[PDB]
Amino acid sequence: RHYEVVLLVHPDQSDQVVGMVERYIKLVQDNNGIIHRLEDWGRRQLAYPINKIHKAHYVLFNIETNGETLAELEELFRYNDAIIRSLVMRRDDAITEESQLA
Amino acid sequence: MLTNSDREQIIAQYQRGENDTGSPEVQVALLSARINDLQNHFKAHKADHHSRRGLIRMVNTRRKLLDYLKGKDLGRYTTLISQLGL
Amino acid sequence: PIVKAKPTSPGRRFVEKVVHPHLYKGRPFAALLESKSKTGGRNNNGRITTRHIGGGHKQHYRIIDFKRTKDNIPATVERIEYDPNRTAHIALLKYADGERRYIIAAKKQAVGDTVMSGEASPIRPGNCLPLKNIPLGTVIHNIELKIGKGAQMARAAGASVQLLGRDGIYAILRLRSGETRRVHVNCRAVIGEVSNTENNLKSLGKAGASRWRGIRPSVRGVAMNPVDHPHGGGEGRNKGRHPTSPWGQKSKGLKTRHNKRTDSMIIRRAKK
Amino acid sequence: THIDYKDVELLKQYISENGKIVPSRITGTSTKYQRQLATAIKQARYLSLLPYTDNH
RNA sequence: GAACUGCAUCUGAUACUGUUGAGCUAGAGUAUGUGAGAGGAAGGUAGAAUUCCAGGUGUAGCGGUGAAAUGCGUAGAGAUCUGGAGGAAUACCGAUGGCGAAGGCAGCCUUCUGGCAUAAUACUGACACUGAGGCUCGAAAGCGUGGGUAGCAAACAGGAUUAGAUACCCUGGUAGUCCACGCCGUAAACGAUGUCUACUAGUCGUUGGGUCCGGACUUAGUGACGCAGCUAACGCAAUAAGUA
RNA sequence: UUUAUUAAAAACACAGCACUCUGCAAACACGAAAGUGGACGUAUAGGGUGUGAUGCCUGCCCGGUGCUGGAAGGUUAAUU
């Protein structure tokens, strides 16, 4: 099952976003997972202030994995405390082309 | 739910002729597999009345098919319920 | 869960027992056991200082590891036992080195799973962590108050505490009493709700069942003579006075809290 | 043709200056693509690529 | 004499009903590909707004009404700004739009799951329709146990109005509304129209598919009109209340 | 269960129910204090009070006296 997940990380904690991402890439790829797309949208001006901040670091990555690894990733996003928001979506296909936002 | 692979496994096991997938035996075997698979879902969501309606419908259809076989070929009905454990 | 007794006897008509088929049917681990004799609610002066205490079944003390300082050594839950000393269940822990201990069993804790203690421990029921390594909003129990002293709060059956936030070196907790309190962030807590959540759903059924637990009968103050109780006296049934204890202390709203040293550790209370 | 919640530039002209979704009777869009528009706009609002309202 | 519409037993007929053997595909089902949807169940989460709490500014009103008054407010309200707690509902989209057997079902995401629509091929070969008793589900209110409790609010309290006012209006306000698991089994539960099948002028919308060349056609819904027919009349009229 | 020795009961207790207190060196009790019980317990716990299985339930009154919250004002000790 393909999953398109967008992460919203704190602008202060943007220096560790690369390790943040590669941790999840390693977790997915270990369990026979495929990273069909990965992009970092960068710092973006939020339309509304989240948690009293006005900019945030956006990272999108479409992957393919199983339910158990999805639950592992969901728990990691929840307890990371640097990811201030997340959106996990189920996609029918695998999306590889660069998104219009990047 | 059942997948295409195990649905084709059931069809191939209860084939009456070549690629028939429409005899009472194959229909009843598919219904039995689907009902036994949905028992797991209903052990988890027992308040699901809308899905349970469809489950009841496939039970009724399986019963009608078994009655039709009993009237059509008695030995065939007995053998089929013997494999399927009904 | 709860099972009702059939009304075969008038003393059975209202028995609702808590039944746990998953509790150990055998005997407790004998090394973690101590002799423990009843007081009858009498102190070293021999005087009754706590009323309505007497009799009951003989019971051993199980030595509970409330401190949980075997950090970074995984333990497996060998069994879940009934404890006569408390309402909660107790999990027998078997550490990697073979040492066995008793802990308070969390509600979502079963036989076979591994518990951990320390700072780098997963957020799973049964693990013991300092309050600073516990994310806000999780249900915790067995809260320390002094650093290193052991769990004191939220230990009864069904106990849970909400970790609301942090305001420096203090963690903000909401207790089942409805009190918001601060506890030093270096104190520990255990993840999860305490087992035996249907403790208060049980019904003793008869007077003898209360006697089996070491509770002696309780005589109302208005049933006495004035030489015994402030409520004693009267021709027929009468109260006549504001309610008080047998020592003249009001029992209908009068607050009895003296501690001026701990006053600054309490944020607020709830009003319902 | 097709529509996604990352098409923020496309979603800007189907949302009013106060942040409300513009109705189909005004934009002229079909019911199916209006439904996809609405769900994409709500997802973008959650991701904070669009505002819910103009006074946060 | 006729009749006694009857019964019984033989004989003949085989169109229809029954019982049977074989065959068939058009009713009904199956497999495979696409599609739409507030269908159901379990979790998580977001943003507005209310209330409460704690503070900064600030000062004499606020609130409410047809007027008022009760009420709140100089112990500093309301207004304004900043933090915190919590509960419930999901503006816009939104639509004689959609889905569901009905009751019903709207933020967003994941998981589990039902039905439906659609093109073609293959398959079974009447497996169908209806259905007394029965069983299941079944709005809201209500009941039990355990939680929750922001707003709204039966009861209840006060203020008005009034001849009176157990009301309508105002200010508060508890059960309830929310959750879990169970009971209840009722509604103008309505289309006041049982279900299923076939046939019978037409015109214009809309939803989900499909096929052709922005239209054309064809399907399954969902609307507005309107013949014949029907109706006591109103009206219904391929989603019949027409013809069976 | 109870008035040993004129009262065994409708009295007391009782499971059950409610109110209230108590964040742990708990409240509460013994004690002059040390030390104890509560409890090697921890708000699903412990104390006090009332009521007394269960069924259906439990209306109005906060004037008085208590209890709880508040502090604008008046009064107010030693002291100085």
DSSP-assigned states of every residue in C136-199:
TT-EEESEESSTTS-EEES-STT--EEEEEE-SSEEEEE-TTSEEEEEETTSEEEES-BS-TTG
Residue ranges in chain A assigned as alpha helix (H): 17-30, 67-80
Burial of A99 (0-12, 13-18, 19+ CB in 10 A): middle
CB D29 under 7 Å to nucleic chain E:
no
Tell me which H or E stretch contains D24.
helix D24-27
Note whether C29 and C100 are within 8 A (CB). yes
Q: Judge: A81–C123 Cβ closer than 8 Å, yes or no.
A: no
Mutate to test the interface with A, among D2, D5, D6 (most CBs of A within 10 A): D6
D49 touching chain A per CB within 8 A: yes
Nearest to D52 among A48, A87, A100 (CB): A48
Strand E at less than 7 A from CB of B63: no
Contact flag, residue B5 CB and nucleic strand E, below 7 A: no
- CA angle C241/C244/C250 to nearest 5° reads 110
| Pick from C85, C83, C65, C84: nearest CA to C75 | C65
The answer to whether C123 contacts A79, with C-beta atoms less than 8 Å apart, is yes
Chain D hits for A8, Cβ within 8 Å:
47-48
Distances (CA, A) of C87 to A53, C17, C155, D29: 47, 13, 9, 65
Interface membership of D29 toward A (CB under 8 Å): no
Total residue length of chain B: 86
